[PDB]
Design a protein around this ligand. Structure first.
Ligand code: HEM
Ligand code: HEM
Ligand code: HEM
Ligand code: HEM
Lengths: 146, 141, 141, 146
């Protein structure tokens, strides 16, 4: 997405403070709890039938970690989101059948997790910028679809 | 469709919010106008500055309204008649806007009570705001 | 939230569909796999050729299921327990897919009964398929 | 959108049979009945409070006619949907505040109206092609948004 300098700074300042070990698996975990049909894509990850299973499943974490540094990739290539996400967009939208509406859903879970982690510090203004980011990713991840 | 575990979770989570009701509704709105500015156009009357006693008061209406909602999880259509009348007949509010505000409420609640905002609670309360929204966007008068 | 005018309209429109129930459900599915092929992946077992006695039989389950649904417009959660159990717990069907199928049902009904498919009927029945879908995608067991 | 020759022919064969006088206003009418919040954008068109008002409002028709030949424009410029829809996308997404989710909704109403008009002749295969079209328009009308 193209957010300004100001915005690219609200974003990177706190992204520097993120635990890249727990943040992704917890957004991926939450995605699996809050939107339980996303469960179908991850049948192989073992047992997803309960809140705490999901949350404690080891495989969820590991792949969450991979989701979130793929967001760290988006942040370093922040103005060719299409190109940096051309491999993942064909993957998800072709080999896996992920309805792109689920792209938008994951970035919102992550936003709530961001808010959950940082609290008062995750200001509306900070969110607003992070909405541009997630929307951007969501949209780049759908490019070789729409 | 809320389950009884959904009801327990919204009921438990909502009074933990409590007096800070009014104050979180206001933050949930401010957060909405900020991240999603097209939704400012619904309140062209309003003072939408960052101070706003107005955004605050209205922020108190929302919070109250949702309390009403948690008191009658069994009959949302019936408790939410008049508000549906308003948001659907009179303001004709586009359904995307309840989803923005709804999401903005979650960011807010999560930034204030991280201990109660468990993965399950998150799930029940999203179903809830998704169910109150449908009432407020449907016409059944 | 269906109004009583919504109920009258679905009840009136549905028995006018009648015996041709089973046959319209099948067309509504064929139309779904055709316009939206990713939804074929839910039935990898199935013969999805254009002939298919299977798509036909299953096309008869759907139609029946919606009849059940119009018989209890007042208690969809309760009548649709087992089907919710199936589509939400067991098949984990993505909610976009109910909207494709739901739309495909409308194209079908409109292509067969243009006299009953008035603008208002269109409105009531979309609310209906939108309400049965929510039941079938929610988990409340 | 890029539909094939085969598809561009399913489409144009019956688009030639369309009454461009009633088809647009009836899809715009239906849009106003079935999705009543779209009513907010057309406060100026007079009375929209009832099914038959909408359906018989003269202004609804007139503008419907303008919506539908704008679809006839899409069909003649069928592989630069972005360019031919760059003026309408800035208009709708800027001056009017139309959430682009409503783009997808109108093309579905039109599809149902198409099915309503032609009946048996509006075959699944025919629909399928017309979904590519409406999706394409929907998506071009959102380009200077997403
Ligand atoms: C927020 C946007 C998303 C991003 C940036 C993202 C990122 C990724 C990445 C980095 C991979 C790894 C591929 C590899 O290692 O070669 C992946 C694979 C995968 N993605 Fe996503 N993802 C997103 C959303 C989603 C959603 C919402 C779903 C399901 C609804 C999904 C389903 C999957 C699955 C099932 C795999 C491979 C599973 C496996 O082999 O273990 N993704 N994704
Ligand atoms: C949880 C969902 C919502 C609830 C519970 C809610 C609740 C309320 C309440 C309690 C009032 C006024 C009560 C009164 O004084 O009688 C109101 C009015 C209003 N609402 Fe909402 N609302 C919701 C969502 C939205 C959304 C998504 C929008 C669109 C941005 C919106 C825009 C408005 C506007 C413009 C008014 C008129 C108030 C005035 O003119 O001062 N609301 N709502
Ligand atoms: C109006 C909404 C729907 C209704 C009423 C409905 C109804 C039904 C019924 C009655 C059955 C089987 C009944 C039985 O033998 O016990 C069934 C099963 C099934 N449904 Fe649906 N369905 C709906 C939507 C969908 C959607 C959107 C999908 C996704 C493409 C889907 C995919 C399936 C699959 C894969 C089965 C399993 C059947 C088999 O394995 O043979 N359904 N549904
Ligand atoms: C299917 C995609 C759509 C197309 C191709 C389309 C086409 C058009 C066209 C051709 C104009 C005329 C501008 C002019 O004459 O200079 C217009 C204006 C307008 N559009 Fe759309 N439209 C679409 C969907 C929508 C939707 C869904 C809404 C509302 C939800 C909407 C709201 C409006 C309004 C309010 C105006 C101007 C009103 C007036 O001054 O009378 N459009 N559109």
């Amino acid at each position: 997405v193209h957010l300004t300098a100001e915005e690219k700074a609200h974003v990177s300042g706190l992204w520097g403070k993120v635990n890249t070990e727990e943040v992704g698996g917890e957004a991926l975990g939450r995605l699996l709890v809050v939107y339980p049909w996303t469960q179908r894509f991850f049948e192989t990850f073992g047992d997803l039938s309960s809140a705490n299973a999901i949350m404690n499943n080891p495989k969820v974490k590991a792949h969450g970690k991979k989701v979130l540094s793929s967001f760290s990739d988006g942040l370093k290539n922040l103005d060719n989101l299409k190109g940096t996400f051309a491999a993942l967009s064909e993957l998800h939208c072709d080999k896996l059948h992920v309805d792109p509406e689920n792209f938008k859903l994951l970035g919102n879970v992550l936003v709530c997790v961001l808010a959950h982690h940082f609290g008062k510090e995750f200001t509306p203004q900070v969110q607003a910028a992070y909405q541009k980011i997630v929307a951007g990713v969501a949209n780049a991840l759908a490019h070789k679809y729409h | 469709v809320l389950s009884p575990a959904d009801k327990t979770n919204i009921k438990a989570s909502w009074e933990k919010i409590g007096s800070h009701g009014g104050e979180y509704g206001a933050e949930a709105l401010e957060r909405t106008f900020l991240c999603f500015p097209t939704t400012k156009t619904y309140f062209p009357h309003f003072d939408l500055s960052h101070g706003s006693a107005q955004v605050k008061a209205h922020g108190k209406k929302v919070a109250d309204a949702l309390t009403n909602a948690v008191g009658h999880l069994d009959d949302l259509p019936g408790a939410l008649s008049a508000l549906s009348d308003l948001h659907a007949y009179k303001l004709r509010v586009d359904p995307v806007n309840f989803k923005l505000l709804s999401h903005c409420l979650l960011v807010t609640l999560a930034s204030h009570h991280p201990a109660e905002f468990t993965p399950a609670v998150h799930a029940s309360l999203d179903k809830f705001l998704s169910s109150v929204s449908t009432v407020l966007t449907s016409k059944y008068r």
